Design an enzyme around this catalytic site. Structure first.
Site, PDB file in Angstrom:
ATOM      1  N   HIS A   1       0.583  -1.263   0.146  1.00  0.00           N
ATOM      2  CA  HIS A   1       0.373   0.337   0.042  1.00  0.00           C
ATOM      3  C   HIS A   1       0.714   1.308  -0.270  1.00  0.00           C
ATOM      4  O   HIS A   1       0.132   2.485  -0.300  1.00  0.00           O
ATOM      5  CB  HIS A   1      -1.495   0.078   0.444  1.00  0.00           C
TER       6      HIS A   1
ATOM      7  N   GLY B   1       3.512   5.718   9.531  1.00  0.00           N
ATOM      8  CA  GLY B   1       4.318   5.676   8.974  1.00  0.00           C
ATOM      9  C   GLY B   1       5.460   5.053   9.724  1.00  0.00           C
ATOM     10  O   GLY B   1       6.431   5.304   9.583  1.00  0.00           O
TER      11      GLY B   1
ATOM     12  N   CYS C   1       4.228   2.220   9.451  1.00  0.00           N
ATOM     13  CA  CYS C   1       3.919   0.804   8.856  1.00  0.00           C
ATOM     14  C   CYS C   1       5.193   0.296   8.489  1.00  0.00           C
ATOM     15  O   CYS C   1       6.410   1.266   7.529  1.00  0.00           O
ATOM     16  CB  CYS C   1       3.276   1.777   7.468  1.00  0.00           C
TER      17      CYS C   1
END
Lengths: 302, 302
Positions: free
Chosen positions: A41, A143, A145
């Site tokens: 993503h 972030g 992530c």
């Protein structure tokens, strides 16, 4: 007589973390040998995330839309592949800091360390469990992530998790390093229900053994129980059923303390049925389930 | 909405840990530039530890009685000095893995990370507080001695602690990197009383702010209080007095949450006077005091 939730030393993983950007979207990647791994993503905007067609989105992206950074060095890409929910970005340099490593898919109830990063830059390390419902109770801000979870055996880093999503409930979901989600989750900004979560019974027992070893033994009784009858009570308090495998796994701790696994279960039973009455175990007022039997052994023996 | 007790990434410190032995006695050292640092009681046996004359013991020891190891490399010594309770061992090679670093003496209530080692080999990392009574509630097994505590700022490792002793009570005591004990302790196997310990009030408040930020706000009330009247209650529950410095330090958290420091104190007051009534805050049933205001900021902002 101290007992702390310890993470693995993170040095081997720190030298593998990078930044990955497209557009307004930046996140963390893992640079091993000649490959960078990150949530797929990264190629989405926040609008794309409602219902992304990753195949079609991936077709529109240029290598040069992907800014891989590592500190104050920018790296360059020569091949790209989508594996499940992970992007593999083949790169123009094999990481000289690559440790010995494996990719593993862990089981619910197992623990691992997370190196929390923001923009390819390590901020902190913590130990957590994979919940029975395959979520992670993490600490992940915008972030984090692409932050990874790992175990270290001897010289080998076993990577087991990559953070992908925060669920509307605030828990985290992610994938193995082949990009398969743990649990029923998907990388779409949608309503996704986690299961009922349960307490990891075997871990609680392990931690009760830690408590005995460290001198905290008020909760020992001289009741006992069968496995079957323990599991009646457990099921009522949303504890995972305990199996004979679980009993077997606790044997070294039973051996060290002279307390039979089934006698420790009968202690736990009374704890579930009566509470702690304002007492603590290992300085905690709740029963802890994020130490495996292996963790307790490793910490108690050096 | 996750909140975890995170340690600093330990990589910069891992490449500085070594083994130090004399006789039956081995422990951890820290290899920086051209100097190894370790507890001076490495030169003692368990018999010597009742009443060691370190001056006289140090006079009897040969360089070659000191086996400094680093993985599968053995190092060699060219000068030795006792600074307070630390031995400085000048060595035949400047550590090529030396990070940028400072030595600091921290204050009670401050936090730091410990890289727990056994025999110069890192086993784990955890975050802890220096207690108001200058003990550490650690996880230190035989020969985790010489394990160090640190903070990282940007590129700089600030070393603040070296583990020396386990007290008869099971808590830990240690020194700064100049070898001065935190607290009244001495490196002698003797009866040594720590003070009454108290809860670090400012840290509890910081953690209540973390809880608000992460969405856990049942304990907010619309009572308020003065500092003076809060401190009456605090003193009764063995909480450290809160000062205007402490209030000042909480201002950024007050600003973010729209909750006045003194209103958060009045929430805490009710918590102390009434308990939690079986509720939890950030998944904990006790009030946590091992996050500083700075820690809460750093974790909430990236």
């Amino acid at each position: 007589s101290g007992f702390r939730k310890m993470a693995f030393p993170s040095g081997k993983v720190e030298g593998c973390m990078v930044q990955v950007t497209c557009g307004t979207t930046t996140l963390n990647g893992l640079w091993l040998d000649d490959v960078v791994y990150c949530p797929r993503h990264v190629i989405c905007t926040s609008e794309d995330m409602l219902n992304p067609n990753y195949e079609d989105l991936l077709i529109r992206k240029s290598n040069h839309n992907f800014l891989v950074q590592a500190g104050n060095v920018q790296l360059r890409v020569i091949g790209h592949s989508m594996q499940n929910c992970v992007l593999k970005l083949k790169v123009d340099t094999a990481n000289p800091k690559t440790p010995k490593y494996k990719f593993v898919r862990i089981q619910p109830g197992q623990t691992f360390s997370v190196l929390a990063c923001y923009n390819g830059s390590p901020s902190g390390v913590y130990q957590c469990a994979m919940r029975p419902n395959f979520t992670i109770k993490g600490s992940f801000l915008n972030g984090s992530c692409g932050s990874v979870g790992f175990n270290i055996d001897y010289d080998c880093v076993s990577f087991c998790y990559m953070h992908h999503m925060v669920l509307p409930t605030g828990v985290h979901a992610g994938t193995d390093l082949e990009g398969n989600f743990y649990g029923p989750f998907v990388d779409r900004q949608t309503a996704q229900a986690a299961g009922t979560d349960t307490t990891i019974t075997v871990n609680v027992l392990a931690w009760l053994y830690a408590a005995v070893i460290n001198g905290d033994r008020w909760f020992l009784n001289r009741f006992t129980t069968t496995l079957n009858d323990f599991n009646l009570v457990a099921m009522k308090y949303n504890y995972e059923p305990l199996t004979q495998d679980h009993v077997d796994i606790l044997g070294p701790l039973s051996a060290q303390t002279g307390i039979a696994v089934l006698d420790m279960c009968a202690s736990l039973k009374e704890l579930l049925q009566n509470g702690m009455n304002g007492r603590t175990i290992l300085g905690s007022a709740l029963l802890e389930d994020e130490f495996t039997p292996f963790d307790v052994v490793r910490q108690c023996s050096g």
